[PDB]
PDB file of C-alpha atoms in Angstrom:
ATOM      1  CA  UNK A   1      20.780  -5.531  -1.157  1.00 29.49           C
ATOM      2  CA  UNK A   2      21.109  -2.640  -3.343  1.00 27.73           C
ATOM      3  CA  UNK A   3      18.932  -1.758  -6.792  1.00 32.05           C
ATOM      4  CA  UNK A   4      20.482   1.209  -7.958  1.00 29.57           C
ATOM      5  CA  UNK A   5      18.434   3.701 -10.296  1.00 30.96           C
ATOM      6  CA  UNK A   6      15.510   2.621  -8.444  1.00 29.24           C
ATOM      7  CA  UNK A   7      11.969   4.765  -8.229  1.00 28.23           C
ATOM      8  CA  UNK A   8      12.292   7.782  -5.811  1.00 28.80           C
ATOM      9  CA  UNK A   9       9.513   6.361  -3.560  1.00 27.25           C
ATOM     10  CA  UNK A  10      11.598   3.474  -2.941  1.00 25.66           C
ATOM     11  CA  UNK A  11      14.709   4.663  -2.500  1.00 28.03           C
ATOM     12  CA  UNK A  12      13.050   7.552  -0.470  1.00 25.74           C
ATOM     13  CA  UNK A  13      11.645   4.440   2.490  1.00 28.24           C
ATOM     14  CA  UNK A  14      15.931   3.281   2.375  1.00 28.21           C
ATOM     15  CA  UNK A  15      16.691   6.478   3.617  1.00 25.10           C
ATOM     16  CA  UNK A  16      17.027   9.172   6.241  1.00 23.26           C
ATOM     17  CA  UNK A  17      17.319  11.747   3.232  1.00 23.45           C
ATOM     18  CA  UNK A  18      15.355  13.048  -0.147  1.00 20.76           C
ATOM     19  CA  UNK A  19      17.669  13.146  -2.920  1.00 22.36           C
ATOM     20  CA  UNK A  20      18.841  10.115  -3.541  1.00 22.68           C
ATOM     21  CA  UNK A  21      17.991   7.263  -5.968  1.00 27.41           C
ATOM     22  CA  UNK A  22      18.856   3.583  -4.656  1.00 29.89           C
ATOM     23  CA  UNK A  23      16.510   1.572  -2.414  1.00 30.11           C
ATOM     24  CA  UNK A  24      18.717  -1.184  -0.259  1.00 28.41           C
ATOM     25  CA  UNK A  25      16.641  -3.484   1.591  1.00 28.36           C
ATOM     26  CA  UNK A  26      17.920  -6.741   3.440  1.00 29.03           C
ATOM     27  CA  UNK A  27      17.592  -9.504   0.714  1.00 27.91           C
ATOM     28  CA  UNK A  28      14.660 -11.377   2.600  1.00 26.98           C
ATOM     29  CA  UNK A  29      12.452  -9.413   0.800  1.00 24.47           C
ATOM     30  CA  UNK A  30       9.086 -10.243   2.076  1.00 24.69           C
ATOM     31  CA  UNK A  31       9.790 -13.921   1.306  1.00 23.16           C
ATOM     32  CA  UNK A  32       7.267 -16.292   3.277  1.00 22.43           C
ATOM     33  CA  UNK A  33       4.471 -13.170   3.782  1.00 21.64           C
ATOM     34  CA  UNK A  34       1.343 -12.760   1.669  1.00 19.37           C
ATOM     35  CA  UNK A  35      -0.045  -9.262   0.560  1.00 18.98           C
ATOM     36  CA  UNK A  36      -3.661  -8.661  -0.678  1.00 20.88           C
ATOM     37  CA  UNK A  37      -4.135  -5.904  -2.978  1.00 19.49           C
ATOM     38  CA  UNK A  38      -7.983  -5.078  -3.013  1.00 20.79           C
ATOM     39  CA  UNK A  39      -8.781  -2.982  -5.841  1.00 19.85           C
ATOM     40  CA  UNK A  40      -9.190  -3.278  -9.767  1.00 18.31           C
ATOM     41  CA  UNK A  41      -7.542  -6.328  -9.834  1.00 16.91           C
ATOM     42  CA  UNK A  42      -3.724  -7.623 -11.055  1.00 18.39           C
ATOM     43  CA  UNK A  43      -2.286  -8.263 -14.726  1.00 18.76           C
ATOM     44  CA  UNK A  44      -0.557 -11.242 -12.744  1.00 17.38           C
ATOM     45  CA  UNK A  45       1.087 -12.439 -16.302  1.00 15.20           C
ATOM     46  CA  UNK A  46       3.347  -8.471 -16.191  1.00 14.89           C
ATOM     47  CA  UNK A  47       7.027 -10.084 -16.094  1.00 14.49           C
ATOM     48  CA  UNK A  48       7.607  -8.173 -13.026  1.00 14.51           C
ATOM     49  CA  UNK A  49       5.900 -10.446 -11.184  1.00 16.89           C
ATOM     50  CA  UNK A  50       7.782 -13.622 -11.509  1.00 16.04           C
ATOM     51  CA  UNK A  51       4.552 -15.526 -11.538  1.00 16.68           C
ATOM     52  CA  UNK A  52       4.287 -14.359  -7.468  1.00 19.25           C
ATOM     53  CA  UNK A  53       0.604 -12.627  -8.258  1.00 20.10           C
ATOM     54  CA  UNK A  54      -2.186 -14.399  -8.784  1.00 21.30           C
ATOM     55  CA  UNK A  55      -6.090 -13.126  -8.949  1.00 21.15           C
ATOM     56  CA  UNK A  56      -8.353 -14.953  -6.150  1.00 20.06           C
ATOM     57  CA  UNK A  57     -11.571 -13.370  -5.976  1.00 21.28           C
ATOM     58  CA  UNK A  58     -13.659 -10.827  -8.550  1.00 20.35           C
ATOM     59  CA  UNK A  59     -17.203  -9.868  -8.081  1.00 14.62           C
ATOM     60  CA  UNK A  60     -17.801  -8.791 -11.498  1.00 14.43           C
ATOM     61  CA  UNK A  61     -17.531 -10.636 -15.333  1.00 13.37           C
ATOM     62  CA  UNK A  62     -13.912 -11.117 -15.030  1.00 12.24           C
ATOM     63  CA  UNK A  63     -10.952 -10.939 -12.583  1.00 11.68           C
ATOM     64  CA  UNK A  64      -8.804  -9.198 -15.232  1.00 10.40           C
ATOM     65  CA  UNK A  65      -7.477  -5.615 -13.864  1.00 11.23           C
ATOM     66  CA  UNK A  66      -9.214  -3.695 -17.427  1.00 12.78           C
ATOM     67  CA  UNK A  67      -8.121  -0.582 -15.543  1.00 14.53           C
ATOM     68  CA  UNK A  68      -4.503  -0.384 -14.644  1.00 12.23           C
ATOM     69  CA  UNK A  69      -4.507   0.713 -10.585  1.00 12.44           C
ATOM     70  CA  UNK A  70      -4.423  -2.114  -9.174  1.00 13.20           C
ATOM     71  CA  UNK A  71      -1.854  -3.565 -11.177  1.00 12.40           C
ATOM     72  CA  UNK A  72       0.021  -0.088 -10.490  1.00 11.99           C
ATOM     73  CA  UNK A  73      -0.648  -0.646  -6.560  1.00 13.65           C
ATOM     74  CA  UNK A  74       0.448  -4.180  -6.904  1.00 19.48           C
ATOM     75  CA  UNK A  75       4.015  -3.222  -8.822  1.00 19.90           C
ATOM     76  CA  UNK A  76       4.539  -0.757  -5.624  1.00 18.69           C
ATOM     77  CA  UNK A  77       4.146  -3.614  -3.172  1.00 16.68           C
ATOM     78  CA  UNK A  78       5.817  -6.245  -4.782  1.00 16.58           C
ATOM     79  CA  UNK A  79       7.282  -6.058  -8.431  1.00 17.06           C
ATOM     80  CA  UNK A  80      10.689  -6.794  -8.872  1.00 18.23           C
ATOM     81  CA  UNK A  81      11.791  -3.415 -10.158  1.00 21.72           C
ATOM     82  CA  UNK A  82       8.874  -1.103  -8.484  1.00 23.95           C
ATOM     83  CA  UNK A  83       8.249  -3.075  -5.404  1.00 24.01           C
ATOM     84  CA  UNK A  84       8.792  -2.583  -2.188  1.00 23.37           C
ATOM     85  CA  UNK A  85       8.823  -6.306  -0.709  1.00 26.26           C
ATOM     86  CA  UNK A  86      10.198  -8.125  -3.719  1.00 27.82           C
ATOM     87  CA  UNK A  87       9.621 -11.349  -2.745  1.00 27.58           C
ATOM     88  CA  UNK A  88       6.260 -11.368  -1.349  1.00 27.37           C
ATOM     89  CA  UNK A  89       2.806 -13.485  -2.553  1.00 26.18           C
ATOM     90  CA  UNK A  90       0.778 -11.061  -4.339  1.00 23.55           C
ATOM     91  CA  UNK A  91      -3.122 -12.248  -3.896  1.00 24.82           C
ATOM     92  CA  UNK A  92      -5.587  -9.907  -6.188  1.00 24.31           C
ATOM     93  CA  UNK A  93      -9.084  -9.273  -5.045  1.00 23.50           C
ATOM     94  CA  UNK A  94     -11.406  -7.432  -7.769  1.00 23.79           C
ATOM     95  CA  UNK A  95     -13.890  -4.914  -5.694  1.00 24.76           C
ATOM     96  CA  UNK A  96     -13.528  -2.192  -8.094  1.00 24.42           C
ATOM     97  CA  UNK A  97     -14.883  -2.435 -11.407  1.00 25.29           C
ATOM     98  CA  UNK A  98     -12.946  -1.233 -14.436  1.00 26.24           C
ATOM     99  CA  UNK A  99     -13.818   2.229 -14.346  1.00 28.09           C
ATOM    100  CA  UNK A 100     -12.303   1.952 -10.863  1.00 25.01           C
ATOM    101  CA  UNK A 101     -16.076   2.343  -8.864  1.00 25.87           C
ATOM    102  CA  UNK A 102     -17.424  -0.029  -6.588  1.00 26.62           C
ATOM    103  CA  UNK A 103     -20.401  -0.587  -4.413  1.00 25.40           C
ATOM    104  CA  UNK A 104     -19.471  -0.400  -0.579  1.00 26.47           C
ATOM    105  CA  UNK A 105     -21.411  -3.727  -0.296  1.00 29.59           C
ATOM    106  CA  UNK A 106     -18.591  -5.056  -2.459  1.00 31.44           C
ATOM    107  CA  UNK A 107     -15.870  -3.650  -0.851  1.00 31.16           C
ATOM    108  CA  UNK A 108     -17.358  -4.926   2.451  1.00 31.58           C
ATOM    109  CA  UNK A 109     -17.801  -8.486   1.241  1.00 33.50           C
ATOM    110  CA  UNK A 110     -14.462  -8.406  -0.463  1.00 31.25           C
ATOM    111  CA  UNK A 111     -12.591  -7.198   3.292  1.00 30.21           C
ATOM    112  CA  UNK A 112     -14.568  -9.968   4.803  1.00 31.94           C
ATOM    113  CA  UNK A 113     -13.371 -12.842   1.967  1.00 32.51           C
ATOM    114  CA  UNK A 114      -9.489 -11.736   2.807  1.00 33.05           C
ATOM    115  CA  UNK A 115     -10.064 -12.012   6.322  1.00 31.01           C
ATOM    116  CA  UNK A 116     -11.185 -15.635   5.640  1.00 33.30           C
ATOM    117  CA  UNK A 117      -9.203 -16.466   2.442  1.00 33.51           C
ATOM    118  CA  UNK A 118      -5.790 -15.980   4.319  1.00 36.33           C
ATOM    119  CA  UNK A 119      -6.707 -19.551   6.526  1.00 36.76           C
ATOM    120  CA  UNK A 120      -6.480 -21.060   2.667  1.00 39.68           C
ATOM    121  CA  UNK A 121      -3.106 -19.816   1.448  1.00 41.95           C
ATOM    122  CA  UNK A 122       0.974 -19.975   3.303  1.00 42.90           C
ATOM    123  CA  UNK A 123       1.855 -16.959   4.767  1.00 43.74           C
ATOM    124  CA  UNK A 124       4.035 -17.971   7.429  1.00 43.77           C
ATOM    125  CA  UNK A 125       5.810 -14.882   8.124  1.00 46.25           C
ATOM    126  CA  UNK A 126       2.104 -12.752   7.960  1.00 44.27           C
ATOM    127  CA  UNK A 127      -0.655 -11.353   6.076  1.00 44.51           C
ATOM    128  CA  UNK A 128      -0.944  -7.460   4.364  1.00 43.13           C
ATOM    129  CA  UNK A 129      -4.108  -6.319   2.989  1.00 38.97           C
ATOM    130  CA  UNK A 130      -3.256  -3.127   1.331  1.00 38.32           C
ATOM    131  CA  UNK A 131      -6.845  -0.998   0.292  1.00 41.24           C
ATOM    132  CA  UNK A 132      -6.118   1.548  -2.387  1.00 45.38           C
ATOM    133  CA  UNK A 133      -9.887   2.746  -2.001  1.00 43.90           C
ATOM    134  CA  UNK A 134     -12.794   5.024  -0.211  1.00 44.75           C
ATOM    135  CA  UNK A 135     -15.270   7.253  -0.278  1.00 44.14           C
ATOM    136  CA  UNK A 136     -17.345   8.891   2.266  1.00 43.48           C
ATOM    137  CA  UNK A 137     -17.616   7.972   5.799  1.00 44.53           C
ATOM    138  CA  UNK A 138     -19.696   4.913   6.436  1.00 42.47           C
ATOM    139  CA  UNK A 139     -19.302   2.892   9.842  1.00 41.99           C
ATOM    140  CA  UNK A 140     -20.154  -0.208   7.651  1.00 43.73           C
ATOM    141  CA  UNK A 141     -17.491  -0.041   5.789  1.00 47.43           C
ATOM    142  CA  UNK A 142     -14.991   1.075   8.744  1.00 44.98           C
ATOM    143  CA  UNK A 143     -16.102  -2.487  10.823  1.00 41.60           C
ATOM    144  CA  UNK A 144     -15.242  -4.495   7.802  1.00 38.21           C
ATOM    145  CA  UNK A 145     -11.572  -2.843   7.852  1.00 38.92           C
ATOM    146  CA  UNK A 146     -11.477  -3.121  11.824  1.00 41.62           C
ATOM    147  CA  UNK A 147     -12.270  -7.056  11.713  1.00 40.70           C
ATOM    148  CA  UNK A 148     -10.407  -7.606   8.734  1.00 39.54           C
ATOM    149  CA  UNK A 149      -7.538  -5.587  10.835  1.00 36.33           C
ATOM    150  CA  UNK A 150      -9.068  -7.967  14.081  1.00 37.97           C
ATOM    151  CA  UNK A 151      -8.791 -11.103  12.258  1.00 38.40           C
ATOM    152  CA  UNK A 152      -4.979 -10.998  11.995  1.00 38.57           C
ATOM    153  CA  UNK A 153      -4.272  -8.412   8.786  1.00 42.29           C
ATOM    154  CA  UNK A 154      -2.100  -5.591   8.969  1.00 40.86           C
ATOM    155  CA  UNK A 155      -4.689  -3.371   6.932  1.00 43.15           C
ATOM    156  CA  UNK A 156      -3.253  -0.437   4.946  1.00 47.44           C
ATOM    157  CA  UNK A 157      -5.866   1.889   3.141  1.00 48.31           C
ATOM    158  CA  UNK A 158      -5.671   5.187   1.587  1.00 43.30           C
ATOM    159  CA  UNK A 159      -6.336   8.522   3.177  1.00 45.85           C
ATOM    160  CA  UNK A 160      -7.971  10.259   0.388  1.00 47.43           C
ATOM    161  CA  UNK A 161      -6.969  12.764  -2.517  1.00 46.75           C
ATOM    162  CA  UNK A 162      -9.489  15.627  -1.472  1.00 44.28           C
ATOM    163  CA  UNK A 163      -7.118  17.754   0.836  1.00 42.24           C
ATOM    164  CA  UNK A 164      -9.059  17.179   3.564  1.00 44.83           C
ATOM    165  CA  UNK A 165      -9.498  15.803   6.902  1.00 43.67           C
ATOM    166  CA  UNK A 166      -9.854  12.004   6.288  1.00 44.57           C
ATOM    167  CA  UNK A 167     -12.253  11.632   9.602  1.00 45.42           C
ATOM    168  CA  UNK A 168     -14.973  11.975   7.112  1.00 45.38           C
ATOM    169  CA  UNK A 169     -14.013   9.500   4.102  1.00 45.31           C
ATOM    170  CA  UNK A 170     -13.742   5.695   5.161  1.00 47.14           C
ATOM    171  CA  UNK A 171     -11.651   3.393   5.371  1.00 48.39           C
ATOM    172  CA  UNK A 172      -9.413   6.254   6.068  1.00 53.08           C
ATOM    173  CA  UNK A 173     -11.174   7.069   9.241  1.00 55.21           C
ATOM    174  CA  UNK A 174     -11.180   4.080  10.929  1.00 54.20           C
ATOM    175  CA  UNK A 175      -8.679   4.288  13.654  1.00 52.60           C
ATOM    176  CA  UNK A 176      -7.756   0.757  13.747  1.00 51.58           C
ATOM    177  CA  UNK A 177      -6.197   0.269  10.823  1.00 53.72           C
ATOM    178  CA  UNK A 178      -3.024   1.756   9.157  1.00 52.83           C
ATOM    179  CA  UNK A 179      -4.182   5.587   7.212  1.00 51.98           C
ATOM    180  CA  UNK A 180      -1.517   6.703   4.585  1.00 53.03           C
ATOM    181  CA  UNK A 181      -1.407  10.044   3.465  1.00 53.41           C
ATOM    182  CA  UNK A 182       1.228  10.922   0.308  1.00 53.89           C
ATOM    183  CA  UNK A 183       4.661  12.797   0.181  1.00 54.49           C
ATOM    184  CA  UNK A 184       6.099  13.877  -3.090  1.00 55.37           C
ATOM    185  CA  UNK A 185       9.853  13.366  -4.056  1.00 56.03           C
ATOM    186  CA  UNK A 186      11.500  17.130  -2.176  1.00 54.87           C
ATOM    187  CA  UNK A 187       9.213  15.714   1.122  1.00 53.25           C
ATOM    188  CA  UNK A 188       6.501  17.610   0.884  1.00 51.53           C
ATOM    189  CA  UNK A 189       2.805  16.890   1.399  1.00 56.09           C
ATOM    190  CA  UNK A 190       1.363  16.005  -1.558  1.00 53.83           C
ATOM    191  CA  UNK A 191      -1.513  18.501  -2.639  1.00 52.51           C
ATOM    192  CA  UNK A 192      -3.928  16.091  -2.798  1.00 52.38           C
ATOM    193  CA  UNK A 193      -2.957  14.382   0.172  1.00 49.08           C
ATOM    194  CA  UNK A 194      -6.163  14.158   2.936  1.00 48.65           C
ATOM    195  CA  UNK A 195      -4.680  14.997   6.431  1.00 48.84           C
ATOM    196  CA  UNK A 196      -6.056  14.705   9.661  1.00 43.76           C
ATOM    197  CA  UNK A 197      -5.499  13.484  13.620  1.00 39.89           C
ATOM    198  CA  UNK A 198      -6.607   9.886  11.468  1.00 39.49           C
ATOM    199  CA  UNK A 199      -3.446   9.321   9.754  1.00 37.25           C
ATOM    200  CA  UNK A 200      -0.846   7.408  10.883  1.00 37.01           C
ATOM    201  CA  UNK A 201       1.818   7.542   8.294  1.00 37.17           C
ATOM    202  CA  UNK A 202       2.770   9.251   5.094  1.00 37.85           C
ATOM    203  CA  UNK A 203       4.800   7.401   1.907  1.00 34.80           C
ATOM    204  CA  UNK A 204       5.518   8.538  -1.442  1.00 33.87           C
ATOM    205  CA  UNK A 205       2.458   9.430  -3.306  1.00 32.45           C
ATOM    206  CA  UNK A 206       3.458  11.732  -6.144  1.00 31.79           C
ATOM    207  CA  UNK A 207       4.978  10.626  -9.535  1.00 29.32           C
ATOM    208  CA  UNK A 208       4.575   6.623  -8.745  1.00 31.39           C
ATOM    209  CA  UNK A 209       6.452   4.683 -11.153  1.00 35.27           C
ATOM    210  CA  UNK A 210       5.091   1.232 -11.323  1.00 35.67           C
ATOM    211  CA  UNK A 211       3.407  -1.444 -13.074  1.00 37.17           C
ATOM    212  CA  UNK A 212       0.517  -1.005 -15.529  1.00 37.06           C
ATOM    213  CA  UNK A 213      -1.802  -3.752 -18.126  1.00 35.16           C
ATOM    214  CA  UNK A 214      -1.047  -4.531 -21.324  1.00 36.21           C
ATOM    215  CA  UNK A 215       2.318  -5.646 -19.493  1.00 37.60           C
ATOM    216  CA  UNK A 216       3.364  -2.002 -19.477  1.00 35.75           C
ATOM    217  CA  UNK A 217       4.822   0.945 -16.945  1.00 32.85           C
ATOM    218  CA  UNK A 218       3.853   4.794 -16.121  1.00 35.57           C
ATOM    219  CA  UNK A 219       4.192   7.558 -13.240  1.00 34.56           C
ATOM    220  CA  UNK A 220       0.980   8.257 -11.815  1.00 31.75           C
ATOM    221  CA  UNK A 221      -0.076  10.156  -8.416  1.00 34.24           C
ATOM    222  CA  UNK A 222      -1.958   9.577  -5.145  1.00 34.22           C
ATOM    223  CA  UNK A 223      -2.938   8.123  -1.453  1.00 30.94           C
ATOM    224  CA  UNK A 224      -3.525   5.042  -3.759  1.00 29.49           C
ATOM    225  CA  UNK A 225       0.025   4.994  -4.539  1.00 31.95           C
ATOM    226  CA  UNK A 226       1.722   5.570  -0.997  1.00 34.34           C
ATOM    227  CA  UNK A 227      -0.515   2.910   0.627  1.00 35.37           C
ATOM    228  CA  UNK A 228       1.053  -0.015  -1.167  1.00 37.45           C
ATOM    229  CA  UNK A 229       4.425   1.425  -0.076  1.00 38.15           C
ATOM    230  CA  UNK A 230       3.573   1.274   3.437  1.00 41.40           C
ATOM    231  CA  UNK A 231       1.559  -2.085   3.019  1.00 43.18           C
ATOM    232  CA  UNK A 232       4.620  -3.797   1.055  1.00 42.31           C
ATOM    233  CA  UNK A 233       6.674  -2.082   4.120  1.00 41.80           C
ATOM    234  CA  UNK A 234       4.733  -4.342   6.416  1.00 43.19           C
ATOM    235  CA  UNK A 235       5.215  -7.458   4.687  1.00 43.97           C
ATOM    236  CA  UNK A 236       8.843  -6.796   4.882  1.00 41.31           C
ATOM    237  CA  UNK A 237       8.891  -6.028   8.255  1.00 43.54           C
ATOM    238  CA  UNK A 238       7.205  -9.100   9.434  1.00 40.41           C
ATOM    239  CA  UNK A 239       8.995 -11.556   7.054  1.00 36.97           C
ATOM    240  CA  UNK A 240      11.931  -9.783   8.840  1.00 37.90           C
ATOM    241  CA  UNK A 241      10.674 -10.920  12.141  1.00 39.51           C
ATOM    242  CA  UNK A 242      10.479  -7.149  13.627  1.00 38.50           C
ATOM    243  CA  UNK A 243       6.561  -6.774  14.260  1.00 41.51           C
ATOM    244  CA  UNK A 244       3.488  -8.903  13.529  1.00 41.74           C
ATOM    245  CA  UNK A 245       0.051  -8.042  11.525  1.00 43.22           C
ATOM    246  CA  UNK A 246      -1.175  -6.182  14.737  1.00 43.50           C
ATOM    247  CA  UNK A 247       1.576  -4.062  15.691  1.00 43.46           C
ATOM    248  CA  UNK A 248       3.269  -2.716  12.232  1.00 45.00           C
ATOM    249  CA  UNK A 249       1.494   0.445  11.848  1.00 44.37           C
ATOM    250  CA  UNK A 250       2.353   1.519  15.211  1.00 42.84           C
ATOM    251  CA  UNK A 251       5.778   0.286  14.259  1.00 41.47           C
ATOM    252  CA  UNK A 252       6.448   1.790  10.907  1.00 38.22           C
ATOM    253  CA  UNK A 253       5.276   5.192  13.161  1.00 37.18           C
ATOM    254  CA  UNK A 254       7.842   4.436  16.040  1.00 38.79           C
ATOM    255  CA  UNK A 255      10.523   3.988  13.517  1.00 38.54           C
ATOM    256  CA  UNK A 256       9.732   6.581  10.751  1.00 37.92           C
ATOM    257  CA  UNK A 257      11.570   9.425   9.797  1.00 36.64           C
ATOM    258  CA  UNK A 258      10.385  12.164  12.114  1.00 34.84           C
ATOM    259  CA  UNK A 259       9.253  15.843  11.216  1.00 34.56           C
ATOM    260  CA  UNK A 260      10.635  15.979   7.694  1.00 35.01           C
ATOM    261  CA  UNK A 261       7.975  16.970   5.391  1.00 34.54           C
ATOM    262  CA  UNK A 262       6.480  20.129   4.757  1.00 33.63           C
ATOM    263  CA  UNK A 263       3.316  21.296   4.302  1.00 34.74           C
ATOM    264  CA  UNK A 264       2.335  19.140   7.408  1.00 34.30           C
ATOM    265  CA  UNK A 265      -1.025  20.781   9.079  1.00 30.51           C
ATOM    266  CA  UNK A 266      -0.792  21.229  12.862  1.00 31.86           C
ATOM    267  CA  UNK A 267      -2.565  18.195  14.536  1.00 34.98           C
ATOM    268  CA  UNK A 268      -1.330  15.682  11.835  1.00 32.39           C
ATOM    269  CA  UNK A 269       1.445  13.568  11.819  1.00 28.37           C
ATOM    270  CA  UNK A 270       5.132  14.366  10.481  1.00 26.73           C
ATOM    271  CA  UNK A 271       6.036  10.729   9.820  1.00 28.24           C
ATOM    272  CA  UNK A 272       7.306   9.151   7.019  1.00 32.70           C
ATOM    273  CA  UNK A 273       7.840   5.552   6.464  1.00 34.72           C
ATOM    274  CA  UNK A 274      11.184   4.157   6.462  1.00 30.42           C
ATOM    275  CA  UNK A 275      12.730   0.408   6.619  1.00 26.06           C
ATOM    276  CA  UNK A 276      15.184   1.019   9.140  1.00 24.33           C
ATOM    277  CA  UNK A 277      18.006  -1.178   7.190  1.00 23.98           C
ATOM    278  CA  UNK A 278      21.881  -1.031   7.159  1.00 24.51           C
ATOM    279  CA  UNK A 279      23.377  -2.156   4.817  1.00 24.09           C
TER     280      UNK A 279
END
């Protein structure tokens, strides 16, 4: 399949070059997998999500998204026009509040609800959990990614937007689970981007179209918006049969595009995550 005039970040993961502006992806689309977007919540009633989102957890007043990022995060992984894996289940959990904080106790609690929330929805073809989200290190916080990772999640989470090493901001540092960092559209790093022996993967980060409340769209930037590329990636990947919830990351890295960005510090990696298809 072929959506022309697509957003640069997805047509950038359809291709072995920067430059060009339509994302092909085999029709399949995610179909059958299940993606978790833990964060401010989703505006699940935006058209672009076909009635495939649905809230199913908030610790606060409401599960409305009264922010806009995770709605934003959710259009990346799976909107019809800004999503990656157009077909997937979109399941909103509400850690952050509407200023976009939340208590790592939260977070924690919300990590452990996917891991057991998945046994209570159909995702035969595999289970996402995409974590838009940190702050600094806490070994707390990087056990609840590694068992939600454990349990049978491929766990994608933000590097950070400090320009730093991400060893000390979690869930970033935990090495079991699937670190993003962000690439703008001429393959650079992005200047915000954290960096770091940590990271396993970079996606487009910088000038995000996607999804937004009030059933709106806009451009924003950061690690928050390259993780939902790589974690609607995933999904696609496994609904395609290619790797399973414990292997992706390592996959998407074996089958990235390979020393293209700039801007890259010594020690990190040069990989940038691409679907592989032909048309």
């Amino acid at each position: 399949a072929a959506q022309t005039n697509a957003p640069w970040g997805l047509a950038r993961i359809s291709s072995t070059s920067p430059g060009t502006s339509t994302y092909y992806y085999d029709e399949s689309a995610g179909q059958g997998s299940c993606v978790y977007v833990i964060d401010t919540g989703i505006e699940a009633s935006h058209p672009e999500f076909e009635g495939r989102a649905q809230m199913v957890k908030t610790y606060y007043y409401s599960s409305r998204d009264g922010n806009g990022h995770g709605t934003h995060c959710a259009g990346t992984v799976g909107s019809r026009t800004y999503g990656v894996a157009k077909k997937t289940q979109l399941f909103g959990v509400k850690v952050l509040d509407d200023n976009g904080s939340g208590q790592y106790s939260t977070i924690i609690a919300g990590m452990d609800f996917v891991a057991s929330d998945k046994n209570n929805r159909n995702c035969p073809k595999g289970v996402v959990a995409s974590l838009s989200l940190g702050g600094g290190y806490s070994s707390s916080v990087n056990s609840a990614a590694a068992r939600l990772q454990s349990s049978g999640v491929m766990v994608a989470v933000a590097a950070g937007n400090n320009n730093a090493d991400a060893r000390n901001y979690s869930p970033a540092s935990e090495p079991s689970v699937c670190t993003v960092g962000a690439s703008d559209r001429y393959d650079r790093r992005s200047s915000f981007s954290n960096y770091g022996s940590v990271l396993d993967i970079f996606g487009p980060g910088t000038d995000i179209l996607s999804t937004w409340i009030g059933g709106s769209t806009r451009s924003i930037s950061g690690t928050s918006m390259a993780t939902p590329h790589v974690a609607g990636l995933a999904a696609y990947l496994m609904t395609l049969g290619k790797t399973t919830a414990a292997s992706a990351c390592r996959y998407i890295a074996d089958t990235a595009n390979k020393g293209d960005l700039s801007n890259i510090p010594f020690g990190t990696v040069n990989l940038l995550a691409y679907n592989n298809y032909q048309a």
